[PDB]
Ligand binder design. Structure first.
Ligand code: PH5
Length: 119
């Protein structure tokens, strides 16, 4: 069954780090020969910036370069996103997408809202 489970809200402090827990799923009969591509988006419906791209890392916006890293193992169906050196501007929406093959790709429209404060 196709899906992405991650928190609706997550809070963090400026200069610290934060973890957005995440897990995904898909049907048992979906073939997976050459792994799964993992992608995280920031403000998808607006600026649409790439935070993580396990398939084409040069697509990662300079804004997040060196500051975001995917924790979980795709093999274990985990998509946890760790964000480092937080900035108030990091506040906004984050959505995960995984792409296996052909039409077997999925963007979670729910996403997680991030709130970074100074103190
Ligand atoms: C078999 C699983 C599945 O339904 N995957 C579809 C996904 C999926 O429905 C969404 O990602 C779930 O949120 O949508 C897609 O188009 C997205 C699209 C739809 C309409 C217009 C433009 C683009 C997508 O690539 O995200 C096409 C996929 O085939």
């Amino acid at each position: 069954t196709w899906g992405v489970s991650s928190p609706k809200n997550v809070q963090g402090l400026s200069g610290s780090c934060l973890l957005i827990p995440c897990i995904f799923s898909y049907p048992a009969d979906v073939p997976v020969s050459n792994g799964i591509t993992a992608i995280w988006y920031y403000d998808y419906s607006g600026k649409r910036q790439v935070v993580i791209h396990s398939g084409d890392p040069k697509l990662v916006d300079k804004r997040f370069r060196g500051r975001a890293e995917l924790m979980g193992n795709m093999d274990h169906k985990v998509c946890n996103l760790l964000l480092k050196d937080l900035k108030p501007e990091d506040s906004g929406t984050y959505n995960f997408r995984f792409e296996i093959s052909d039409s077997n790709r999925w963007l979670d429209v729910k996403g997680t809202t991030v709130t970074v404060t100074t103190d």
